[PDB]
C-alpha cells in the first residue's frame, strides 16, 4: 500500500492576497493524514486524497508527513510566507500566536518568485504515544486520544509587491504524502470534508 | 538557539527619498522576547557570547 501513500496529491487551496497585513494567519492545517477539503460541483463529489484513502482503513497511524506547497506567481510578484509547526494536538487555541512568537516553533520561510516552485515541508514525528488513533469513528471528544500531532500555520511574512498589470494575488496548492508511514489494526470508515 | 527567527517587517515605498532609513533595529534586544524559542535559554542565564547571522 505504499504505492498510493507515497504519491503527493492535492489537499488544500488558498490565496495569498496583496491586501493582508504582516503576521496575519492565512490558513491553519491539522497535521494528520485524514485532512482534505476539496470538492467538486458537477458531479457532486468530495475529492479524497490518496493518503486519506489508505489511512482511513486503519485504527492507528505513525510516520512523517510531507507537505508540498506549490505557488503560482508571475516573475513579477514578490513576497514571503512563513510555514510554522506548533506541536500538540488537533484542539489547541492557536490563533493567539503572534508572528514573533511563531519563530519559537520549528518553521521555514519561502521566497515566492524564483526558478523553483515547490517547498517540501517534512514534519517530524512528535508525540507522547507511539501511535495515534483514528478517532473520527467516534462522535464525542475525549482528553487523551487524538488524531493529529499538532497544527500548521501559514503567515504573511513580507507583503506582496507587484506592478499594476498583473493580478493582485498568488494562489498556493497544498499536497499531502507520507514517508516512513506505518499503519495497523484495520477497520472500515468513509471520511468527510474538513470544513475548518 | 541556533535557528532563524523573524525579527522585523518593514516596507519600502516610492516616497522614501535618498538615504532614508527604512529599518533601524537593535538585533539582540529583539531576540530577547517571550515569543521566540531562544528566550527559554536566555531568561535563566545571565551572560552570553555569540555570533549573529542575518538574512
Amino acid at each position: 500500500f505504499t504505492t498510493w501513500t507515497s504519491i503527493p496529491t492535492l489537499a488544500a487551496q488558498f490565496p495569498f492576497n496583496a491586501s493582508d497585513s504582516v503576521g496575519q494567519q492565512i490558513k491553519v492545517i491539522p497535521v494528520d493524514p485524514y485532512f482534505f477539503q476539496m470538492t467538486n460541483t458537477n458531479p457532486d463529489q468530495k475529492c479524497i486524497t490518496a493518503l486519506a484513502s489508505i489511512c482511513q482503513m486503519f485504527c492507528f497511524w505513525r510516520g512523517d508527513l510531507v507537505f508540498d506547497f506549490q505557488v503560482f506567481p508571475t516573475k513579477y510578484h514578490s513576497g514571503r510566507l512563513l510555514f510554522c509547526f506548533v506541536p500538540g494536538n488537533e484542539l489547541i487555541d492557536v490563533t493567539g500566536i503572534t508572528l514573533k512568537q511563531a519563530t519559537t516553533a520549528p518553521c521555514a520561510v519561502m521566497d515566492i518568485a524564483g526558478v523553483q516552485s515547490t517547498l517540501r515541508f517534512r514534519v517530524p514525528w512528535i508525540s507522547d504515544t507511539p501511535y495515534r488513533v483514528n478517532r473520527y469513528t467516534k462522535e464525542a471528544h475525549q482528553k487523551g486520544e487524538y488524531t493529529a500531532i499538532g497544527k500548521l500555520i501559514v503567515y504573511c511574512y513580507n507583503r506582496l509587491t507587484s506592478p499594476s498589470n498583473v493580478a493582485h494575488h498568488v494562489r498556493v496548492n497544498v499536497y499531502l504524502s507520507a514517508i516512513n508511514l506505518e499503519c495497523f489494526a484495520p477497520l472500515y470508515h468513509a471520511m468527510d470534508v474538513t470544513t475548518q | 538557539g541556533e535557528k532563524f527567527f523573524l525579527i522585523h517587517s518593514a516596507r519600502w515605498l516610492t516616497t522614501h527619498a535618498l538615504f532614508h532609513e527604512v529599518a533601524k533595529l537593535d538585533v539582540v534586544k529583539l531576540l530577547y522576547n517571550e515569543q521566540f524559542a531562544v528566550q527559554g535559554l536566555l531568561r535563566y542565564h545571565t551572560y552570553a557570547r555569540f555570533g549573529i547571522e542575518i538574512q
Partner: antibody
Amino acid sequence: EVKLVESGGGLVKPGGSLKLSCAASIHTFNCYGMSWVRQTPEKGLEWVATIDAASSYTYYPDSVKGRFTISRDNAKNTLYLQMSSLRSGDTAMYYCARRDNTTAQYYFDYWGQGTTLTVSS
Amino acid sequence: DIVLTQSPAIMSASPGEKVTMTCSAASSVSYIHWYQQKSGTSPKRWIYDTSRLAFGVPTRFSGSGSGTSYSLTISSMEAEDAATYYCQQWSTNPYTFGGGTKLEIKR
C-alpha cells in the same frame, strides 16, 4: 470581502437581559478571534470582550467582568454577547470586530455596522 | 490603568498644508495603532503597529514616535480626510483608546 452584520439590540429596562448576535461571512471564522467594542457619544471607546478560536478562552476588563458573557458557534459562524444586570452606563453603540495579528501585537481590521442599546426606564 | 491622551482635540486644516496630531501615553508603550471614523459609519483599517499603513489608505500619511510620544503626520491635506482619528494600545489589560481628534476642513 469581510462583512460583519450585527443583530439584536433595542430598549431594555435596567435590570433586564438581552443577547446580541453578530454574523460572519466568506472568510474563515475559526482562524481569528472576535470582539465587542462600545461607543458612547460622550466618551469613546471601550472594549468589553474577546473570545478565541474555540470557546475556551475569554477575556474581560475590570468593569464588565461578571456581568457579560461571550460565546461562539463555529458551525453557524455567529457571535453572542449575553448581557445581564444592565444599568445606565450601558446605553451606547455596540460593534462586533475581528481581532487579527500583527508582528508583535493585535489589531482590529474589520468592524460591523453596530446596533444600538438603550438602557433607561 | 494606563491612559492615552490626544493633545489636539479639534483641528482645522486647509487643503494643501501639513497636519500633525499626537497621542501621548502615561508610561512606555511599545506600539500604538490608529483608526479613522468618518461621520455616520464605523472605524476602519488605518495604521497598524506604528508606521505601518493599511492597504487602501493614501500614501501621504505617516506615523512615528516611541516610548511616550506618538504622532500622525499628514503631508498634504485633501478633502477626503475630514474624520476622527483614535489611537489604541495593547500593552496591559484595559486596552484604553484615545479620546479622539476631530479633523475638519478649514474654509
